[PDB]
Coordinates of C-alpha atoms in Angstrom, one line a residue:
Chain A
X1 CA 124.1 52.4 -137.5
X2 CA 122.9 52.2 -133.8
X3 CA 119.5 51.3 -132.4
X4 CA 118.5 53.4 -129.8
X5 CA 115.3 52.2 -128.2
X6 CA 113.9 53.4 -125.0
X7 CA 111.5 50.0 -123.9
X8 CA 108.7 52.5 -122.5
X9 CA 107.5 55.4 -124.1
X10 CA 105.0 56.2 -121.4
X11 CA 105.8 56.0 -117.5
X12 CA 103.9 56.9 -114.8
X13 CA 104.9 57.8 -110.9
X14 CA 103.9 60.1 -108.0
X15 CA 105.6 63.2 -107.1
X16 CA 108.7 63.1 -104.7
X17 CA 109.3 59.0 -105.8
X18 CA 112.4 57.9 -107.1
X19 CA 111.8 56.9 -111.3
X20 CA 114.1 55.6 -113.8
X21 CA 114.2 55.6 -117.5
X22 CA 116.2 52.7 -118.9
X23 CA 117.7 53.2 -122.5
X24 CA 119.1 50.2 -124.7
X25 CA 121.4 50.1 -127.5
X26 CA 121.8 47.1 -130.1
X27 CA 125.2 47.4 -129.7
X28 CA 128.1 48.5 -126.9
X29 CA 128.7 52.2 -127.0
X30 CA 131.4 52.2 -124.3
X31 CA 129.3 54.6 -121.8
X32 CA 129.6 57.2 -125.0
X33 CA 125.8 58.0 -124.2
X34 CA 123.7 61.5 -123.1
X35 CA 120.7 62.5 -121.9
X36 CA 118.3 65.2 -122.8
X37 CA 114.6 66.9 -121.5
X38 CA 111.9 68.3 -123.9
X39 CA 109.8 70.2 -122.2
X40 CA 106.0 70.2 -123.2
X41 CA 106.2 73.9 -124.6
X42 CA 109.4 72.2 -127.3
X43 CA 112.4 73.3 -126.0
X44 CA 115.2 70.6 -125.8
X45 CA 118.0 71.4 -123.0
X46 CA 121.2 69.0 -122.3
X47 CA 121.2 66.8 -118.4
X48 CA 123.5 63.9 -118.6
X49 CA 126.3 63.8 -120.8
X50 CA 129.3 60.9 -120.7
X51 CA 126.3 58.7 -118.8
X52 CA 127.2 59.8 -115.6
X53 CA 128.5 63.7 -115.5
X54 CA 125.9 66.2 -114.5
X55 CA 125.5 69.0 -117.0
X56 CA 125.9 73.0 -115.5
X57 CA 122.8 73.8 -114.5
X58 CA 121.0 70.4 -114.0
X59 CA 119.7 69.9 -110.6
X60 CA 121.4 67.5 -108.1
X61 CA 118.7 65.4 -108.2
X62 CA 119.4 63.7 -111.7
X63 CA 121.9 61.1 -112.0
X64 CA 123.2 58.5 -114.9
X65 CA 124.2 55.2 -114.9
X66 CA 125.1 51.9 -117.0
X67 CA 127.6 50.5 -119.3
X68 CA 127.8 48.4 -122.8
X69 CA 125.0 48.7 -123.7
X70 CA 122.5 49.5 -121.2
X71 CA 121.9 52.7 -119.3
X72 CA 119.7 54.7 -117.2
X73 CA 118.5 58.2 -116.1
X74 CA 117.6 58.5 -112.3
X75 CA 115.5 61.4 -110.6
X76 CA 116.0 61.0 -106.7
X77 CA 112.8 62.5 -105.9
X78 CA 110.3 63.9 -109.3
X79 CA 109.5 67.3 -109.4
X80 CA 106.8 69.3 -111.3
X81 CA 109.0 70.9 -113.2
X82 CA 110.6 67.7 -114.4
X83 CA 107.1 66.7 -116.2
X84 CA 108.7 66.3 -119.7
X85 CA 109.9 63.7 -122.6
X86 CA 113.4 62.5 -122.3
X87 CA 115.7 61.2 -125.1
X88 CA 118.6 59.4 -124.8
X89 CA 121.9 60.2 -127.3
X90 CA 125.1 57.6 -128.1
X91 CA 127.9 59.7 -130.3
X92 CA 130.1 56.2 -129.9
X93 CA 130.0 56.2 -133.7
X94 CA 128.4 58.4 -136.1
X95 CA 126.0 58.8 -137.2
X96 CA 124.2 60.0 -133.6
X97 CA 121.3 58.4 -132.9
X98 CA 118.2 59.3 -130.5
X99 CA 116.1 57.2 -128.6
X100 CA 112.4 56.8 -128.5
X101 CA 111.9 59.0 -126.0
X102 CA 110.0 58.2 -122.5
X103 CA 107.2 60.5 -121.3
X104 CA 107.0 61.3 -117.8
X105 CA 103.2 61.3 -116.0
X106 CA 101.8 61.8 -112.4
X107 CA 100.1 59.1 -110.7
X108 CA 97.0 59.8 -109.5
X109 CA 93.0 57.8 -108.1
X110 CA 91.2 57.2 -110.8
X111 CA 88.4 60.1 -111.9
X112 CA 86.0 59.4 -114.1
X113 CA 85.2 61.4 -116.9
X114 CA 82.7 64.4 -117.3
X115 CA 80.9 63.3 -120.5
X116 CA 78.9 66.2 -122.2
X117 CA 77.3 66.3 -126.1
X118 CA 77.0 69.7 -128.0
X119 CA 74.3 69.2 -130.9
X120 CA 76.1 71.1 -134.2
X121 CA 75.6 74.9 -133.6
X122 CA 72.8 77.1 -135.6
X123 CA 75.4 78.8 -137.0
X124 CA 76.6 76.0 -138.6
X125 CA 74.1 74.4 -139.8
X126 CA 73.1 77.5 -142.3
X127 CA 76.5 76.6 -144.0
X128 CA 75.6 73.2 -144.4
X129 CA 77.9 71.9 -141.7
X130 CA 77.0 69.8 -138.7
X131 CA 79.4 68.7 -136.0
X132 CA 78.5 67.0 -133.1
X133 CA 80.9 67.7 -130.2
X134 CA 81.4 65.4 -127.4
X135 CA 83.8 65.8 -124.4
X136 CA 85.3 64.0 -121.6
X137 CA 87.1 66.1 -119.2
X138 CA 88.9 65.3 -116.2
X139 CA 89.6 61.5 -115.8
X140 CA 92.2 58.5 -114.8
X141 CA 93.9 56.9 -116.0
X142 CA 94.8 57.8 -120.1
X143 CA 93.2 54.8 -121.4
X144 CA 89.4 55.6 -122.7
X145 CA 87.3 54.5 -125.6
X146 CA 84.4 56.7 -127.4
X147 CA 81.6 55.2 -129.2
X148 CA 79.0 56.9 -131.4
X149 CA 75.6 55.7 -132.0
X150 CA 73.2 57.2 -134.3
X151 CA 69.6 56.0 -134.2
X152 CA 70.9 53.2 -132.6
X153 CA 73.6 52.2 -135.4
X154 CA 77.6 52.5 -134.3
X155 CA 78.6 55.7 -136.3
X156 CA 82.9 54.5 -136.9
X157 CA 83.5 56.7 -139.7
X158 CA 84.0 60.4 -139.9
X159 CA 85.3 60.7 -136.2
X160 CA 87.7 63.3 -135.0
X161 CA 89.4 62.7 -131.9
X162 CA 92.2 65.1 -130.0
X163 CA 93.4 64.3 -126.2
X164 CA 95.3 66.7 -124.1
X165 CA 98.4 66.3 -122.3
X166 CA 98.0 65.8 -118.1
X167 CA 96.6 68.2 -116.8
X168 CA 98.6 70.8 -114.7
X169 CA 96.7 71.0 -111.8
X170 CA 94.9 67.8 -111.3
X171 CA 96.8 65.3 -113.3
X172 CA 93.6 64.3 -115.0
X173 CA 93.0 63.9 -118.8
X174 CA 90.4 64.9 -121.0
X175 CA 89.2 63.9 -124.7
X176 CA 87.5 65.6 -127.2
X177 CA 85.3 63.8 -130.2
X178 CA 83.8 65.2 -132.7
X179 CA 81.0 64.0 -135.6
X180 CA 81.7 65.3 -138.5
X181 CA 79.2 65.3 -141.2
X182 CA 77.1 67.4 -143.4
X183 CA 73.4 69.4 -142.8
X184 CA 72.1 66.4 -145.1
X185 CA 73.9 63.6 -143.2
X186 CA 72.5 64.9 -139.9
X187 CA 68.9 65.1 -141.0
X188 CA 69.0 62.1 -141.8
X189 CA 68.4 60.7 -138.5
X190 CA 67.9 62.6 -135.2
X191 CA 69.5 60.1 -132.2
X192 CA 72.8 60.9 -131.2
X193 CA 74.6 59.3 -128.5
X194 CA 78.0 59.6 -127.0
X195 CA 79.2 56.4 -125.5
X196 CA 81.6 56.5 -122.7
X197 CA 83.8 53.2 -121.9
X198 CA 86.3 53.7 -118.8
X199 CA 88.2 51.8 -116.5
X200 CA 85.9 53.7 -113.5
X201 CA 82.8 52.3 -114.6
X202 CA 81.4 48.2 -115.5
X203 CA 78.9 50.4 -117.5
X204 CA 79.6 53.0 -119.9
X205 CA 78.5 56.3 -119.7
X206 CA 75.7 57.1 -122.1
X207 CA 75.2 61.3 -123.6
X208 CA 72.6 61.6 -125.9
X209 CA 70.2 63.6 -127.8
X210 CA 67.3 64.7 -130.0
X211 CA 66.6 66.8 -133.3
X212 CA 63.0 66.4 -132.0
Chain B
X1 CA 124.3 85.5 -124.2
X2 CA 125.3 82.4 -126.2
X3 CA 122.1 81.4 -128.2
X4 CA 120.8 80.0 -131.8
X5 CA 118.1 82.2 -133.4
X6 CA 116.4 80.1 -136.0
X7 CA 114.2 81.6 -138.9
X8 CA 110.3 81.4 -138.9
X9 CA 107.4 79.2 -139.6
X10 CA 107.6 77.9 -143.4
X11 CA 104.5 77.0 -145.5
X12 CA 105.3 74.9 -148.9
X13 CA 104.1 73.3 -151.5
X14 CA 104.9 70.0 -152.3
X15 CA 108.1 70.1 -154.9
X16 CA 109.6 73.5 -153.3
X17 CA 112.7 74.2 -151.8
X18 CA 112.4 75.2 -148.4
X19 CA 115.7 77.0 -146.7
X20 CA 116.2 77.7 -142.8
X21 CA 118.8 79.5 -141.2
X22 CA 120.5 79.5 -137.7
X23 CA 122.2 82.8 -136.3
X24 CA 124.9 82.2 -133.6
X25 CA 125.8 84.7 -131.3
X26 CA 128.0 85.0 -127.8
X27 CA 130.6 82.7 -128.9
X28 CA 133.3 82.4 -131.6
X29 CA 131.3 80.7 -134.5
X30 CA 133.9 78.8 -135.7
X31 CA 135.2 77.3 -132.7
X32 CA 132.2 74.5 -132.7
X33 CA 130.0 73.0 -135.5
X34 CA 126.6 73.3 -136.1
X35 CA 123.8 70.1 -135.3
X36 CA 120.3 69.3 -137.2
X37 CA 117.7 67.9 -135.4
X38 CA 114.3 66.7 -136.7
X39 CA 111.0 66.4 -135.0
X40 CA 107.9 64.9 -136.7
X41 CA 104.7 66.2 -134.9
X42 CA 103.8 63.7 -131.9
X43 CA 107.1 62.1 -132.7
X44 CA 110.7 61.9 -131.2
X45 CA 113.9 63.3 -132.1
X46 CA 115.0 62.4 -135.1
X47 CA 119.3 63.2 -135.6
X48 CA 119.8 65.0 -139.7
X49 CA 123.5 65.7 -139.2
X50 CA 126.3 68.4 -138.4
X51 CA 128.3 70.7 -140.3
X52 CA 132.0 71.4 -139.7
X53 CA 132.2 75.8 -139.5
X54 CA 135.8 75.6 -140.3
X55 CA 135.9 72.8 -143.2
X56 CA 132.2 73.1 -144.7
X57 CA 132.1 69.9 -144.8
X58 CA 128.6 68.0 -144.1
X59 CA 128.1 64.8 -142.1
X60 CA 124.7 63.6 -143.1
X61 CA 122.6 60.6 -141.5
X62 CA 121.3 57.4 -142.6
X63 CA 117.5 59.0 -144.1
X64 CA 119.1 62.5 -144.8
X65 CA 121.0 62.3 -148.0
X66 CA 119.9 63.6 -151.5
X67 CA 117.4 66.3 -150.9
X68 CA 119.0 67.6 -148.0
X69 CA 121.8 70.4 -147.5
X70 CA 124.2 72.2 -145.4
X71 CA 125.8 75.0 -145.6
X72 CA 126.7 78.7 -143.7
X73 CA 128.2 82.0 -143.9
X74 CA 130.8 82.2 -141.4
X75 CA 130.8 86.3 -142.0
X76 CA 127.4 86.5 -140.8
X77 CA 128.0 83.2 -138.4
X78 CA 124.7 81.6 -139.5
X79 CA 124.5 78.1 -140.5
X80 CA 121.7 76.8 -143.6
X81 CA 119.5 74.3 -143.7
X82 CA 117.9 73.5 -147.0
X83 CA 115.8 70.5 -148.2
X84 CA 115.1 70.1 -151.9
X85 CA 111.8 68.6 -154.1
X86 CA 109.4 69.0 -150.4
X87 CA 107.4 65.7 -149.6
X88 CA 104.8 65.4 -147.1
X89 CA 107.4 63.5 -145.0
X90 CA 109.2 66.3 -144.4
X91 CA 106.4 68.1 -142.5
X92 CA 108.0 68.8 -138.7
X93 CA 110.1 71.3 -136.5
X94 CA 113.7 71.2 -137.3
X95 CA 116.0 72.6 -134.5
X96 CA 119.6 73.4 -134.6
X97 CA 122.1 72.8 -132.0
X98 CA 125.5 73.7 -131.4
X99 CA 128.0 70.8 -130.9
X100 CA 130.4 70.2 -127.9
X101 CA 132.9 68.1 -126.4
X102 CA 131.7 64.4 -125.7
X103 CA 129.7 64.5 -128.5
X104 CA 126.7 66.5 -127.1
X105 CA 124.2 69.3 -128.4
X106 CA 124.0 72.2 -126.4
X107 CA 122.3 75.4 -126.9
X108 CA 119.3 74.3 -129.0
X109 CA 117.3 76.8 -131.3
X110 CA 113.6 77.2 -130.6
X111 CA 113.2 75.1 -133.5
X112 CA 111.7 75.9 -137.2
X113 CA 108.5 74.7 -137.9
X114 CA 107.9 73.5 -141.8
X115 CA 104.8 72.3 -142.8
X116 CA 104.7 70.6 -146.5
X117 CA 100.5 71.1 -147.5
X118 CA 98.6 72.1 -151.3
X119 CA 95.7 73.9 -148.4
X120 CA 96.0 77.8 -148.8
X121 CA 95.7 80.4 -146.1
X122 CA 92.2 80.0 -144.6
X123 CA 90.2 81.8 -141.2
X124 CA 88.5 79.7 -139.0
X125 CA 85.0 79.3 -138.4
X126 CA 84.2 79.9 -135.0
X127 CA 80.8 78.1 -133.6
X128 CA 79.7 78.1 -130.0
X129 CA 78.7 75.0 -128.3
X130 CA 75.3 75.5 -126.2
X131 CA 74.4 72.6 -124.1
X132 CA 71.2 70.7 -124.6
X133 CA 67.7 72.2 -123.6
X134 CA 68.1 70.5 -119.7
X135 CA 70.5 70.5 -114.2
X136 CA 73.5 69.9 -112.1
X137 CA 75.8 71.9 -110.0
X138 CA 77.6 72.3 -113.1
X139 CA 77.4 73.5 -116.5
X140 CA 80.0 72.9 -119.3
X141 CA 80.1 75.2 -122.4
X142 CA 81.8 74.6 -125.6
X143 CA 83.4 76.2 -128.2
X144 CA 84.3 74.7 -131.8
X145 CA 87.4 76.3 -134.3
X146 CA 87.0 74.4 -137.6
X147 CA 88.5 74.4 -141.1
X148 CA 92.1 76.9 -140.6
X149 CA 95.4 77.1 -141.6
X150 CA 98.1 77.5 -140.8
X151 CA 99.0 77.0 -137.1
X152 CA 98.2 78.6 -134.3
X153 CA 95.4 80.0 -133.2
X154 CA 94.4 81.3 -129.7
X155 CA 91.3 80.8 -127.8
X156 CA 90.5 82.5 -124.8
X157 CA 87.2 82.8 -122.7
X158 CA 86.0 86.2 -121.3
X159 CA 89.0 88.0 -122.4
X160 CA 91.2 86.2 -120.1
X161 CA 89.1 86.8 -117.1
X162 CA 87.3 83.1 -117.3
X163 CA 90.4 80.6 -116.6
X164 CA 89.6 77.8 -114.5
X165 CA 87.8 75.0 -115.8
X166 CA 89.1 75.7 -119.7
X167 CA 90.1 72.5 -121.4
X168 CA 91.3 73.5 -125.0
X169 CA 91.9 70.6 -127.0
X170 CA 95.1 70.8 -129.7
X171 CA 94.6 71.6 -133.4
X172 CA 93.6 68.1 -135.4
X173 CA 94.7 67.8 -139.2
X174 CA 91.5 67.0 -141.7
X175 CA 91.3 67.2 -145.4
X176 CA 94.7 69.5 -144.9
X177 CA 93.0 71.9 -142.8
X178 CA 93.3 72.2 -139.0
X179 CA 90.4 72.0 -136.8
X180 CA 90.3 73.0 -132.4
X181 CA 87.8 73.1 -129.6
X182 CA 87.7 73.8 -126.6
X183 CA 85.0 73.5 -123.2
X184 CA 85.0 75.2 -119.9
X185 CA 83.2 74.2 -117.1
X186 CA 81.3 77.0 -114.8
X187 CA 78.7 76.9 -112.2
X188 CA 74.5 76.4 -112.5
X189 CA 74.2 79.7 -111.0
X190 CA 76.8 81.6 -113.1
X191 CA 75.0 80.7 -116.5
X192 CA 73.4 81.9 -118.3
X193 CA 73.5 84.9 -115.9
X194 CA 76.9 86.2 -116.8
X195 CA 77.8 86.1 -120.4
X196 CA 80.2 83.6 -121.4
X197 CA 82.5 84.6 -124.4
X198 CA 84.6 82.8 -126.6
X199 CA 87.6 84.1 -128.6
X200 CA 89.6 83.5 -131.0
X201 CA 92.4 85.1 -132.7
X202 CA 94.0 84.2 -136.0
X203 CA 96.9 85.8 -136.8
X204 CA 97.9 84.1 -139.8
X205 CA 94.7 85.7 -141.7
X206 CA 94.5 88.8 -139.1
X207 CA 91.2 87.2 -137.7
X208 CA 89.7 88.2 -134.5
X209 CA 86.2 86.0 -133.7
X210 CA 84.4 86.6 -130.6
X211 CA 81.3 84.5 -130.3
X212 CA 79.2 84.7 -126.8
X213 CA 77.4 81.1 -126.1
X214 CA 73.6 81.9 -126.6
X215 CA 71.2 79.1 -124.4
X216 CA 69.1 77.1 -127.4
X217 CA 65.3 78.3 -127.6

């Protein structure tokens, strides 16, 4: 069967600029290829189709090209509302393939991030839990690292990490890690840091605390 | 008025037999066939196969053939999808989508999400998130969801009335349970003068936490 592979997954670009999403197949598929947009909420609704013919409904602003084996989808100028994930489809031969899939992203100055630690709750701690929270909120670009150092040791185990999409407003990202570990684990030492490495800063940005 | 209606959310056990269905409605069902789409959470689409409403005749994919079925009722005009002996592979959303000329899917379903886990039905426990003991213009609250299932839960800060400056952070899997937090930045001079609120609402266990962020001391 077909390879269809979309060479970025990620792509970034400002509001009102022209972008393009190139999509490759390991074989010709004779312009037999579609396009399709999955909004962040999930839902999947059809664009291109026969890699140049607009679908009803589509704004006039999206366009397809390419033949043999290479196409592309073309936004004349990006909208808000075109902030989304877009797959590309061949039905040349069955069975139908999807690409990787290329998320688009606003380009923005870089921000750097609003680091703040949250020592495990009382609450918690009379259940024998103790996680300790640390987030970074509103920077750019997506790339970040977190480091956790406990009484001066790097802490690489038991880490929980979630990042959000782009923001809606702002464009910015944000990170949330979490220390998980028990009431025993935690008493055990007493200084907790929350290291912060960015492309914004030559020095990272420290967060710490005491059991004291 | 033509849309695909898929079933709800499924919870199994690894080994069960999972079945999802696909009402059609606004159009002649047996004028086009019926597409399978698979999505593995935080991946991309993922094409199962179609099924021929006149014929009943299945056209399976590549990874798609063995444990997986289809089939329909054309006197109800819904089409089946069912997946036999569950792994944990099989976690993700499956839509459905009805087929067209030049070979496209149009008219997706809002997609059926199937989540393959041993982890029972549990409520989360809610924790606020006080800052340390000590200045700034600024003040950032927190507020922890640990240790749930299944998906989703809903988090909200003042009833609604606190939404700027919310950053809720999606559900993480650990040790088959789901874990969430979430931070909202205020003002110096709005906390701890107004009461800050954090809640959270599980359906799946009829769970309703609210839990106001107390300063340490």
């Amino acid at each position: 069967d077909i390879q269809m592979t979309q060479t970025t997954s990620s792509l970034s670009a400002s509001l009102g600029d022209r972008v393009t999403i190139s999509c490759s197949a390991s074989q010709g598929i004779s312009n037999y290829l579609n396009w399709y947009q999955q909004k962040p909420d999930g839902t999947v609704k059809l664009l291109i189709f026969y890699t140049s013919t607009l679908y009803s409904g589509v704004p006039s602003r999206f366009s397809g090209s390419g033949s043999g084996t290479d196409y592309s989808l073309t936004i004349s100028n990006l909208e808000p509302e075109d902030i989304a994930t877009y797959y590309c489809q061949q039905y040349s031969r069955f069975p139908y393939v999807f690409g990787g899939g290329t998320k688009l992203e606003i380009k923005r100055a870089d921000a750097a991030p609003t680091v703040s630690i949250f020592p495990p709750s009382s609450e918690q701690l009379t259940s024998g839990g103790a996680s300790v929270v640390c987030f970074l909120n509103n920077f750019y670009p997506k790339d970040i690292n977190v480091k956790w150092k406990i009484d001066g040791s790097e802490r690489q185990n038991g880490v929980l990490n979630s990042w959000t999409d782009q923001d809606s407003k702002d464009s910015t990202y944000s990170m949330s890690s979490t220390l998980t570990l028990t009431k025993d684990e935690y008493e055990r030492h007493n200084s907790y840091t929350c290291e912060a490495t960015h492309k914004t800063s030559t020095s990272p940005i420290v967060k710490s605390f005491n059991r004291n | 008025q033509i849309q695909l209606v898929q079933s709800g959310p499924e919870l199994k056990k690894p080994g069960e037999t999972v079945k999802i269905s696909c009402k059609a409605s606004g159009y002649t069902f047996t004028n086009y066939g019926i597409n399978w789409v698979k999505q593995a959470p935080g991946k991309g689409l993922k094409w199962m196969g179609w099924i021929n409403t006149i014929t009943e005749e299945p056209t399976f994919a590549e990874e798609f053939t063995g444990r997986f079925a289809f089939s329909l009722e054309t006197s109800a005009s819904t089409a089946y999808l069912q997946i036999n002996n569950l792994k944990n592979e099989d976690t993700a959303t499956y839509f459905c989508a009805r087929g067209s000329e030049f070979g496209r899917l149009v008219y997706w379903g809002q997609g059926a999400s199937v989540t393959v886990s041993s982890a029972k039905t549990t409520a989360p426990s809610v924790y606020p998130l006080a800052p340390v003991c000590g200045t700034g213009s600024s003040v950032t609250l927190g507020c922890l969801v640990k240790g749930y299932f299944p998906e989703p839960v809903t988090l909200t800060w003042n009833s609604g009335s606190l939404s700027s400056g919310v950053h809720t952070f999606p559900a993480v899997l650990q040790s088959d349970l789901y874990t969430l937090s979430s931070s909202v930045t205020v003002t110096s001079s709005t906390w701890p003068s107004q009461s800050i609120t954090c809640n959270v609402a599980h359906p799946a266990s009829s769970t309703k936490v609210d839990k106001k962020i107390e300063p340490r001391g």
